[PDB]
Amino acid sequence: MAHFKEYQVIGRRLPTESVPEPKLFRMRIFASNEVIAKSRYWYFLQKLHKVKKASGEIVSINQINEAHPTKVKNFGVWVRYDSRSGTHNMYKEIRDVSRVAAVETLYQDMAARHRARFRSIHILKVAEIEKTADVKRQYVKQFLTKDLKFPLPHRVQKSTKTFSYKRPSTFY
Amino acid sequence: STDSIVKASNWRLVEVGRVVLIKKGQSAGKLAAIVEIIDQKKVLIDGPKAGVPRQAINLGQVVLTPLTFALPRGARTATVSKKWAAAAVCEKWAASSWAKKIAQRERRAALTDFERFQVMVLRKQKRYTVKKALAKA
Amino acid sequence: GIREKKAEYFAKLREYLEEYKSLFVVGVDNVSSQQMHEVRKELRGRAVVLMGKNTMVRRAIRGFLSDLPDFEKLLPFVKGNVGFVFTNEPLTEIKNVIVSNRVAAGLTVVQVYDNGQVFPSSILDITDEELVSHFVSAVSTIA
Amino acid sequence: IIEPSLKALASKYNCDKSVCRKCYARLPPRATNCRKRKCGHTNQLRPKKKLK
Amino acid sequence: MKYIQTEQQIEVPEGVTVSIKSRIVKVVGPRGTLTKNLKHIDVTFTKVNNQLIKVAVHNGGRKHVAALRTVKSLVDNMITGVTKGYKYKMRYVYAHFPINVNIVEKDGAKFIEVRNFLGDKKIRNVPVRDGVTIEFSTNVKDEIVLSGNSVEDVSQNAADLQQICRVRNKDIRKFLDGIYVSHKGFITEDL
RNA sequence: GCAGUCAAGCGUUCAUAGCGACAUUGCUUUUUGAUUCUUCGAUGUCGGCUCUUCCUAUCAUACCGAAGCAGAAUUCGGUAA
RNA sequence: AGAACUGGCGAUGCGGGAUGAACCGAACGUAGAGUUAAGGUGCCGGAAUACACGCUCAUCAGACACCACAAAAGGUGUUAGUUCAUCUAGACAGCCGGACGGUGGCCAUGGAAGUCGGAAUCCGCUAAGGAGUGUGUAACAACUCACCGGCCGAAUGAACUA
Ligand SMILES: [Zn+2]
């Protein structure tokens, strides 16, 4: 829950003489360190298969780096979450350079707008959106128009000293 | 008058090809180009020539300059270089007061104590010839 | 129903596109519900007139580019207020039925299609004298 | 007395109005919500009542 | 959601010249000249040609954006006011005591003065706003007509005249007396 | 004690002008209880008289919006101590 | 008011919670140097008027566990989301064209031709055009709208969640 890395977690039920070689399951988990990621792996597995980590084991844990960490992409994000009064699915879009960058703004946004802390959200799917205008959401489409430019009116420069011998301007 | 007159704020635009001066960080001091807009707050930049690594940056740690050159959006580092060079961006920058004051201020700061002393003595010389002028017309 | 009724249109559009060999694209700017009714009567002999929404037509024609393909050149003239008048009778007579009669204060020809071709109906209206004087001035060019 | 058309004129002002049911505001006759903050911009409106 | 740009358009007709500098707008036409301070809204003007000036908000939320059209309109009505002009018409409406209406002055001032309203011994006075000029129709009974370049000033001066005749303590559906706005439009260009 | 939400009903007709059942959310601390924290080597009961000040859930008075407001009279409501 | 287990207060200062028996931190010989806890760092006051993404404007905003209260119910305030339906076979909106023939449809009557009104609500030609949404006439005329089209080009309508 912080500056996110994304991990492959791969685990399985412990072998039995009856079933050596039990099936392997993978999740992609966003977390900040690997102790959290494996926690998170088990949290989800327990809600999906009978297994507690006391009957299972983690076979591999590997960080998945962004393939094109400077191509700008538009991501579709699918999320399940709890409100003070129920639980909701929700599709949002995020424009960024990496999943890991996108996911982190997802979490800030769920916090800002819906007052959802991390314990309350599940990431359902995160996906680069291939064709522009499969993009559904205005506040990301806006950036997709041709020869896009804008000013940044009213610039405030931070001052290094407490007094200034001239009245400042906001001119950019 | 008889034409409609409307002076319009001539803002530096965030746009592909807009060249920016990096305020903070490790690339602090260097020029990079906006390659692709991310949102109202972030952009992809790239400063191959100054050796600032193509990266997503927050506009608040950058300052827009008046210079801009032709660059297709999304352009990878290699073609950013080709274009930046074609455009003679550093040439234009160097020629500006803005870049000149930075240089001036940099040079002052490197002055030795002996050097500071010479500037004094030279100033006093210039002063002298100035005050007699400023007294004749 | 609404999908149905559109599909119905494409159907009858296609049917005249196969059945009749020639084609009139007519401009009907202004032109009353009454005027049209009377071009129907005036042509109840041969011609059939068929009107519709442009985007329906462009689309439908394009989907008919597999069989019956020269209709791809019809496309640059379905724009503004237009309609088709299909016919197997010949050329001018019908054009003059269209242009002339039930004009008041009329409707206009904008391009014609016959056997994979594209007149302007300026052509058709020809004096038999430019045809006369170009076999004449060239039997004079041979003489 | 008062020609029909001026009685009508006077009524656009005096009577073709609706009324907030919480706070009583005289409101535009086609309004959906009360403009007033004291009643919470309620949409509980009724027509102003017509004379006899 | 913040709209990266959003803009509106202002047609300048022949014969008028609008000039704007730090949001102080001066509009000049055949009828006269109006000015208006727009400093209370961050909008930016831009002249495309002399027929057409644009107004934008950059990176603005809903309520900001709502300010955009309204600036366009205000500036539109400046242009209309100084070409076609504004004219609002009113009617006296009274069931019994005829409402007796005149212009009077004090210190070269000018007031609309209203007498006998519902039989009142009191006299009502409404200052005539500068720029707005009062007539009385020749061939519509009980008419009163305010005109000028400023819809704002014409319309408010008409409002002042009607608000001054309200009828207190009487069922105002039965007692409909008043001066009411009966038509509103332009000086030039038919009626 | 005082104020709401729903609206079946009242109100010739018409839920909500004025009201409002079944239910239901509250507020107050001049009612009365419940408690027993302080005071039993002491804090002088009830009422009145006199006098000052404060609250507002406003009876009158100022200006308003509603009405089953024609006028007069009233009634509901706002800003108001 | 009365029990269960544990930890506390009582018997106990110290740091934090402004204040405060019982909360948080941490228990105590006399001191030096360093580091922290809980809690803080605009100014009172030691410590970034630090960095980052949002959200919020309150003629009664809000601001931190124990803790110094607020509910049902409402809001076309603003935010993000859901479901259903419409739409590149071109919607929604805006402007613009057409809005026709049987036919003044039958009653009825001073007159009533789509528009006082009773009762019906069919067809034709259509891309479309009601035996008629209103405006209007004495009654026709004229205007209008439903309906279909031209243009434009990617959204639109409704009900909801928090
Ligand atoms: Zn209200």
Side-chain angles (χ1 to χ4, degrees), chain E residues 56 64 82 94 117-118 138 157 173 185 187:
Chain E
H64 199 169
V82 95
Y94 57 95
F117 178 69
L118 274 194
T138 105
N157 200 161
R173 316 115 95 200
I187 307 188

Side-chain angles (χ1 to χ4, degrees), chain B residues 36-132:
Chain B
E36 177 143 322
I37 288 174
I38 286 168
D39 56 44
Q40 262 278 359
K41 316 209 93 114
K42 294 189 224 312
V43 294
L44 188 56
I45 69 184
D46 208 352
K49 197 178 198 141
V52 10
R54 182 186 250 256
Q55 74 207 249
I57 211 192
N58 187 299
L59 273 172
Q61 35 225 18
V62 124
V63 38
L64 308 188
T65 89
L67 303 179
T68 48
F69 59 110
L71 211 215
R73 117 204 132 71
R76 321 160 67 76
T77 303
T79 97
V80 184
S81 244
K82 187 183 177 170
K83 296 260 179 254
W84 186 286
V89 175
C90 301
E91 210 130 328
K92 286 180 184 53
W93 176 239
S96 78
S97 323
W98 185 352
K100 288 169 191 209
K101 281 187 217 186
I102 293 156
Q104 201 200 26
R105 133 154 40 91
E106 236 139 52
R107 154 89 275 221
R108 293 217 178 159
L111 295 176
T112 282
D113 185 60
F114 184 35
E115 269 172 333
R116 280 173 238 123
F117 181 85
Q118 315 176 36
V119 167
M120 183 190 184
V121 158
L122 279 161
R123 259 167 130 258
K124 293 219 280 215
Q125 256 140 34
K126 181 170 122 178
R127 212 228 273 113
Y128 190 88
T129 120
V130 153
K131 302 224 106 95
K132 349 190 310 167

